[PDB]
Every structure is written in structure tokens, then in C-alpha cells.
Amino acid sequence: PEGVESQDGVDHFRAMIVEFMASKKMQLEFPPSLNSHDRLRVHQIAEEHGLRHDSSGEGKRRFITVSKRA
Ligand SMILES: Nc1nc2c(ncn2[C@H]2C[C@H](O)[C@@H](COP(=O)(O)O)O2)c(=O)[nH]1
């Protein structure tokens, strides 16, 4: 009995992360098009899944990177 039960059904960013987890991508660089909510979504999901999540840059250069190494 292990996994995620609190499913969002189908989530854009959660779909991006689940692909990322099984992909060659050691780090998933998201576009600056993500707003606070979009990032919050990613931070939440990555935190629950167990991956490293951080936003780098500034604001006009602010992007979020998810890493498989956590
Ligand atoms: N759960 C969680 N949320 C985070 C973390 N860091 C930032 N957030 C949230 C706070 C903000 O509402 C949202 C996006 O804002 P930003 O900190 O600019 O990425 O992400 C974190 O480490 N864990």
C-alpha cells in the first residue's frame, strides 16, 4: 500500500512531473509563464512525490526547477 491517493484527477503540472519522473530529464526547467499559483502547484506535487523543487532567478527571470535527486 504505497502511492498517491489525493489525486487531482488530471493536472497539467502533475502530468509534467509524472513524465519527468520516468524521463531522462534529471531536471525539469519550467518556463517563466508559470505564476505563483502554477509554481505552488508544482511545489505541492513535487514535495509530495519526493523530488527537489526550487525557483531560481528573480521575477522576470524567475523559473522553477524540479530535480529527481532529492
Ligand atoms: N509546499 C511548498 N510550497 C512552496 C515551497 N516554496 C514555495 N512554495 C509556494 C509558495 C508560493 O505560494 C508558491 C509560488 O511562489 P514562489 O515562492 O515565487 O515560487 O509556491 C516549498 O518548498 N514547498
UniProtKB/Swiss-Prot annotation:
Domain R3H: 7-70
Subcellular location: Nucleus; Cytoplasm; Cell projection, Axon
Tissue expr: Expressed in all tissues examined. Expressed in the developing and adult human brain, with highest expression in the cerebellum. Moderately expressed in fibroblasts.
Family to which the UniProt record says this protein belongs: Belongs to the DNA2/NAM7 helicase family.
Clinical note on disease: Neuronopathy, distal hereditary motor, autosomal recessive 1: A form of distal hereditary motor neuronopathy, a heterogeneous group of neuromuscular disorders caused by selective degeneration of motor neurons in the anterior horn of the spinal cord, without sensory deficit in the posterior horn. The overall clinical picture consists of a classical distal muscular atrophy syndrome in the legs without clinical sensory loss. The disease starts with weakness and wasting of distal muscles of the anterior tibial and peroneal compartments of the legs.
Free-text note regarding domains: The R3H domain recognizes phosphorylated 5'-ends of single-stranded nucleic acids which promotes binding of nucleic acids and stimulates ATPase activity.
Subunit structure: Homooligomer. Interacts with RUVBL1. Interacts with RUVBL2. Interacts with GTF3C1. Interacts with ABT1. Interacts with ribosomes.
Function: 5' to 3' helicase that unwinds RNA and DNA duplexes in an ATP-dependent reaction. Specific to 5'-phosphorylated single-stranded guanine-rich sequences. May play a role in RNA metabolism, ribosome biogenesis or initiation of translation. May play a role in regulation of transcription. Interacts with tRNA-Tyr.
Name of this chain's protein: DNA-binding protein SMUBP-2
UniProt source species: Homo sapiens
